[PDB]
Amino acid sequence: THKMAKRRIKITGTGKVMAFKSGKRHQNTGKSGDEIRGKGKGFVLAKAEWARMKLMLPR
Template sequence: MPKMKTHKGAKGRVKVTARGKVVAYKTGKRHLNYKKSGKTIRLKGKKFVLFKGDARKFRVLLPYDWR
């Protein structure tokens, strides 16, 4: 059986914590920020835990990142 390949795009977008949660950054902070409030920009800089359904999809894309 050949080795499974890690999806490089998914690897750069999410991180799996020690307890197995999938964490990602919020979207919408790269550009066009002049029309957004400071509070919105600050909140978009934080990480958040993905929902179980989305995390399950990343389990397939990142086969070696699970504890």
């Protein structure tokens, strides 16, 4: 696909799929907690079976 290209869904050495963290992103943040600077790299491989064939040339 071209969708996950500059986007999330990064493959790794083990072939596992890397997800970013969403809430909140560039708007509607406010509030208090760390959590703003706490949206990092993440993952699950349950959905990821379907994310491999979407973009695999690269990781």
